[PDB]
Structures are given as C-alpha cells and as structure tokens.
Amino acid sequence: CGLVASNLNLKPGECLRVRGEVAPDAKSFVLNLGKDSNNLCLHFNPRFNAHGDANTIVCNSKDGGAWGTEQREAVFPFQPGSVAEVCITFDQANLTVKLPDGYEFKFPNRLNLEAINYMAADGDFKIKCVAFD
Amino acid sequence: CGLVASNLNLKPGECLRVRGEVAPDAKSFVLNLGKDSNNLCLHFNPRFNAHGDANTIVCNSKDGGAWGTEQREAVFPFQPGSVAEVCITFDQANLTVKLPDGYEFKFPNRLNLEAINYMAADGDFKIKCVAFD
Numbered sequence: 001c002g003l004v005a006s007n008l009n010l011k012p013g014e015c016l017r018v019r020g021e022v023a024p025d026a027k028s029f030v031l032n033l034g035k036d037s038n039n040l041c042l043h044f045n046p047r048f049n050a051h052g053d054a055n056t057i058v059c060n061s062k063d064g065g066a067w068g069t070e071q072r073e074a075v076f077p078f079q080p081g082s083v084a085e086v087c088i089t090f091d092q093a094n095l096t097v098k099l100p101d102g103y104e105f106k107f108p109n110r111l112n113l114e115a116i117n118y119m120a121a122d123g124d125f126k127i128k129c130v131a132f133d
Numbered sequence: 134c135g136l137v138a139s140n141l142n143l144k145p146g147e148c149l150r151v152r153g154e155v156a157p158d159a160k161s162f163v164l165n166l167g168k169d170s171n172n173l174c175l176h177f178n179p180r181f182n183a184h185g186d187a188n189t190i191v192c193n194s195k196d197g198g199a200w201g202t203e204q205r206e207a208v209f210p211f212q213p214g215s216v217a218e219v220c221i222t223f224d225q226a227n228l229t230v231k232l233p234d235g236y237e238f239k240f241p242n243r244l245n246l247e248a249i250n251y252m253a254a255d256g257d258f259k260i261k262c263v264a265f266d
C-alpha cells in the first residue's frame with residue numbers, strides 16, 4: 001500500500017497533481033480519490049497487464065462500499081519504467097483527468113461530495129510529488 | 134486539521150520537502166512527523182505569538198501519547214503571509230530540519246525511528262506541495 005492522504009480539502013476547480021515512477025515491471029497502479037476508503041468519486045486504475053486487461057485505463061466509483069459501473073478509456077499514455085504525472089480536478093458533474101501525452105477525459109461525478117478529502121495510492125507507482133493548487 | 138499523510142515510507146537519508154503558505158495572520162503552525170499520531174519523532178512548531186512564546190520554534194517528541202521535553206531553537210526564519218519550504222531528513226541519532234534562508238538545526242531522534250510513515254500539518258500553514266527525494 002502506498003501513500004494515503006486525508007483532510008485534503010480539495011475544492012471544485014482546484015487541481016490535484018501527482019507525479020510518480022511507474023515500475024519497470026508494472027502490472028497495475030491505482031489512484032483513489034474521495035471521502036474515505038468506502039467512498040470514492042474516482043478509482044483510477046491503469047492496467048498494463050492485470051485482470052486479463054492490457055494497456056487499459058479502468059475507472060470506477062465506490063459509494064458506501066459498493067463499486068459503481070466500470071468505464072474504460074481508449075488511450076493509454078503510460079509506460080513501464082517511466083515518470084508520469086496525473087492532474088485531476090472536479091465539479092458537480094464530472095472529474096476531469098489530465099494525463100501525459102496530451103490526453104484528457106472526464107469521469108462522471110457520482111457521489112455528492114463538497115470537497116475531495118481523501119487520496120490513496122496503490123500498486124506499481126512510487127509517488128514522488130503531490131501538489132494541491 | 135491540515136493535511137494528514139500516512140504510509141510515507143521515508144527512510145534514513147531521504148529528504149521530505151514541504152512547501153506551503155504561512156497565513157497573513159499567523160500565530161503558530163505545526164508539522165508532526167513520526168510513526169503515527171501518538172508516536173512523533175518530531176513535533177515542529179514555529180510560534181510567531183503563541184503558548185507563551187514569541188518568534189520561537191518549539192520542538193518536541195511524543196512517545197506512546199506522552200509529550201517529551203520541549204527544545205527551543207535559536208533561529209526564526211519565518212514571517213506571516215509568505216511561502217516557506219521546510220526540508221526534513223533523519224537518521225539513527227537526529228532529525229535534521231532545513232529551513233528558509235539557509236538555517237538548519239538538529240533534533241534528537243528520541244524514539245529511535247528507522248522509518249517515518251506519518252506526517253500531519255496543523256495551524257497557520259497551508260501545504261501546497263510535498264515531495265520525496
């Protein structure tokens with residue numbers, strides 16, 4: 001288990017930036033954002049090779065412990081053995097996730113949070129920097 | 134409170150860098166580092182005007198919930214309403230705290246910690262970036 005941060009108080013429009021090292025033999029990594037471990041407005045899960053999936057970004061939510069409906073994106077701007085930065089903001093409608101190689105997508109905001117207060121990292125990604133604009 | 138982070142996995146010799154905003158009306162701010170909230174190898178508390186002190190850094194430890202003996206530093210390179218970076222490293226014997234304007238001091242590692250896994254901020258200091266080298 002990686003870094004866990006709480007009391008983030010990230011408000012709408014504000015940008016969370018996370019930079020880390022993807023392991024040379026990375027299979028999967030996770031960035032979870034929300035209120036706490038049972039309440040995630042974003043589970044962000046790039047799979048290099050995990051759960052039968054190759055080079056696929058899997059996203060979901062978790063509401064009161066229940067996983068929501070999974071969604072997949074169609075670009076994979078991550079390499080094993082490289083540094084990667086991810087930038088995330090939100091409003092009441094969507095989270096906007098900005099990634100390397102110019103790519104960006106929205107994920108619906110399915111929870112009712114006033115602020116994002118919790119972040120947790122897991123898997124094959126070593127956090128080097130977190131910034132809270 | 135302010136930001137709380139766990140699973141930091143900071144090891145001897147590694148540098149934890151914290152940048153933030155000292156409030157315009159600052160009286161006091163705190164960075165706590167250790168194993169968890171009850172086991173702090175460093176309670177770092179710059180006091181502009183608080184708890185009987187003026188322009189003094191107070192340091193302490195907390196061991197199993199019990200506060201140690203306070204140490205007061207000789208330097209105070211902070212001002213209200215400014216940005217500040219603090220860099221912390223540690224080893225067997227001491228924490229080394231590097232402050233703005235080239236100041237630094239040592240505080241004994243009273244718990245003999247071999248890893249720092251917990252950090253928390255409180256008071257008139259808003260964390261904007263946390264980095265690991």
Ligand SMILES: CCCO[C@@H]1O[C@H](CO)[C@@H](O[C@@H]2O[C@H](CO)[C@H](O)[C@H](OCc3cn(CC(=O)c4cccc(O)c4)nn3)[C@H]2O)[C@H](O)[C@H]1NC(C)=O
Binds near residue numbers: 059124
């Ligand atoms: C809809 C049902 C379809 O079948 C599958 O069902 C699976 C089980 O529910 C589903 O996987 C789960 O998807 C969730 C998101 O929708 C989560 O990604 C579930 O994992 C949660 C998790 C695991 N971990 C630890 C981790 O990622 C990790 C831990 C250590 C090392 C490492 O490289 C990674 N953290 N969070 C993950 O197990 C698969 O994504 C899903 N596949 C499809 C195509 O939908």
Ligand SMILES: CCCO[C@@H]1O[C@H](CO)[C@@H](O[C@@H]2O[C@H](CO)[C@H](O)[C@H](OCc3cn(CC(=O)c4cccc(O)c4)nn3)[C@H]2O)[C@H](O)[C@H]1NC(C)=O
Binds near residue numbers: 161178191
């Ligand atoms: C004046 C005669 C009594 O002596 C005092 O006794 C005090 C109580 O023991 C002692 O203070 C405590 O020292 C501890 C370290 O030895 C801690 O600093 C105690 O505070 C814990 C604390 C508080 N906070 C929240 C905080 O920093 C904050 C929160 C909101 C606004 C703000 O400006 C600041 N975080 N941690 C702090 O209350 C003071 O250091 C001590 N002072 C002297 C000069 O001896």
